[PDB]
Amino acid sequence: MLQQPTGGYTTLEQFAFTIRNDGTNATPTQFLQLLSYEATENELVKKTIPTPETHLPSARNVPGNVYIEDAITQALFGISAQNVNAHGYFSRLSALALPNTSARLGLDGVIYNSETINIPFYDPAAVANFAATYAKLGNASTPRYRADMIDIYAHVGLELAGTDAERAAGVMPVKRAKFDSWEGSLISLSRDVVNWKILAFLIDLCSLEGEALRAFKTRNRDVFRMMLFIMSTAVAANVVNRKVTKRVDRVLEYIGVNSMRTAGRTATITYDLSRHEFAAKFLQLTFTRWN
């Protein structure tokens, strides 16, 4: 029954987000330094983000317990081909949104009906606010509710590849980002970033207050710029790798502009139609909370 000192569960060594590359294991901060980019002249301008709709879906009665956490990641950064998922037990979340409920949310990423014996879980009070915002992710494919899978991506590219000199004006030149690679590359970061404990992050966003939110956003603006990069190569138009003499570069076509089908096919992670609606519903919901 862990608690947060307002440092948050992210101020802990229990679960930390680390990519493995370079023959040893490294933190996200060290990785991003390799991403160097130029310009190709198609101005990607920051639009406004429309507020979400308050209505929460109903968690249709369900016996047993689903791994609510699993699906959140298994859709966003899921590597292995994921079939249609617009359907599913994806809104049991809202059953935590009400005041007095007994249903608890454990560590590891499960949603128990009744707290059982020997299972460590997040604090029942700070998991409430996380739900009154993310249980709203249940209606991701209901017509007349789904977000728009175009404009948010403009917001995304201004984040992982936008030098501050640009974001302070709200406009930037479309970039083509290439870092140096190894073998599997793009697919390897996916099989890696999947098992990260995303819930250990999102809970902090909706609780931690201005004192420990300005400090929280400063140490974690990088764990965000990591699960935002992989989520981006699932959109880019090309992945062709340039060649030096012995070196290899993974030029990525157009980060921040959204096409409709993956450049990866075989080389990188791939999305599906049912997932395009999903990524837009996540990316929209999370940005208001972050920004």
Binding site: M1, E115, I117, N118
Partner: protein, 49 residues
């Protein structure tokens, strides 16, 4: 010593299974949390209820 007295320790899981579902039948407010500060005054007064 005496192999007795001192303080009585029990694991949280043993508490919830036997004690928590049984004191719950009666209309008594759930056991008070031990204070980070000192409350050697009301420790038994809130335990009295």
């Amino acid at each position: 010593d005496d192999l007795d007295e001192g303080i009585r320790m029990t694991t949280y899981d043993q508490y919830l299974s036997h004690i928590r579902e049984r004191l719950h039948i009666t209309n008594v407010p759930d056991p008070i949390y031990i204070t980070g500060a000192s409350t050697p005054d009301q420790i038994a007064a809130s335990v009295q209820a």
